[PDB]
């Protein structure tokens, strides 16, 4: 259960190349990979690449080619050749030593996160107030705006209104003193 | 804080979509967490049911305790059953104009 650390490799990884990962993992100090790698048996002779996959040694091996940032550190160890048995990565991708599993935990962490947001949502709307017998039937822009009973008929006044800028020309304003 | 919460939700959705798109482009024992999650979901469902029952028995218990002045099915009928029936121009029902026998002016 040691994928949760968000540690990094800085100087215990003088390099994170294909074999340089095995030699970095030889010297776990402090965070670069597991102290329980083949660190010690890889460092008995020298900073090397045998304990990666060639000899039977559980080091942070070149599980695949990655020179640019860091090879995908897999604690590669199998008594026959051509296999790495995975639990994590000492690579510098995402700047951390994550779990190196599939999209499963990635999306599931995405969704646990969004669900944090969602429960926030549900409660936030929850107890604002409720509709009741009357919507929130409790405690027993609306009053007025323009005109309630403002009937036409004599609206005819309108009709004449349509005479007046005409009986006489509106003067220009353009002055908001 | 309506606009603040709206912007927060929008930023969260944008971050989620960005993380999903980035992941898509890059791809190209005794824990019982599920049991605790199911227990929390059942507790939330029971709380929602209790809140619904409370809102029902609290906002609709007006006429159940004592008949008081309430337009909702308790006051509008008293005048209606006494004067007119259901009619709607916009919200107008049963004007008193004696038009049943008036024949003078509407």
């Amino acid at each position: 259960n040691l994928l949760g650390i968000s540690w990094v490799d800085s100087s215990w990884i003088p390099i994170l190349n294909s074999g340089s990962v095995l030699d970095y993992f030889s010297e776990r100090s402090n965070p670069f990979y597991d102290r329980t790698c083949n660190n010690e048996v890889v460092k008995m002779q020298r900073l090397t690449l045998e304990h990666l996959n060639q000899m039977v040694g559980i080091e942070y091996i070149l599980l695949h080619a990655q020179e640019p940032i860091l090879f995908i550190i897999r604690k590669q160890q199998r008594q026959s050749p051509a296999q790495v048995i995975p639990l994590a990565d000492y690579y510098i991708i995402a700047g951390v030593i994550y779990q190196a599993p599939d999209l499963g935990s990635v999306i599931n962490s995405r969704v646990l996160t969004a669900v944090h947001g969602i429960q926030s949502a549900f409660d936030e709307a929850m107890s604002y107030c409720r509709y009741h017998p009357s919507k929130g039937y409790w405690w027993h822009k609306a009053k007025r705006k323009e005109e309630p009973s403002s009937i036409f008929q004599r609206q005819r006044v309108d009709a004449l209104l349509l005479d007046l800028r005409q009986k006489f020309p509106p003067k220009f304003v353009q002055l908001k003193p | 804080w309506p606009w603040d919460s709206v912007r927060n939700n929008l930023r969260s959705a944008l971050t989620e979509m960005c993380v999903l798109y980035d992941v898509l482009s890059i791809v190209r024992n005794p824990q019982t967490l599920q049991l605790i999650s199911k227990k929390k979901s059942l507790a939330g469902a029971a709380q929602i049911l209790l809140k619904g029952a409370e809102r029902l028995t609290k906002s609709v218990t007006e006429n159940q305790e004592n008949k008081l002045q309430r337009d909702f099915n308790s006051e509008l009928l008293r005048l209606r059953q006494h004067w007119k029936l259901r009619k709607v121009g916009d919200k107008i029902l049963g004007d008193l104009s004696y038009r049943s026998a008036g024949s003078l002016f509407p």
Binding site: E146, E147, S149, S150, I151, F152, Q155, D158, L161, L162, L164, R165, P170, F172, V173, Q174, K176 | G89, D90, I92
Partner: peptide, 24 residues
């Protein structure tokens, strides 16, 4: 209102009234 009151344009008539409540 204060603001700037620069509502010039033209029109200056219309009606701005309401009483539609008699089956019409």
């Amino acid at each position: 209102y204060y603001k700037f009151p620069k509502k010039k344009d033209v029109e200056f008539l219309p009606p701005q009234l309401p009483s539609d409540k008699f089956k019409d």
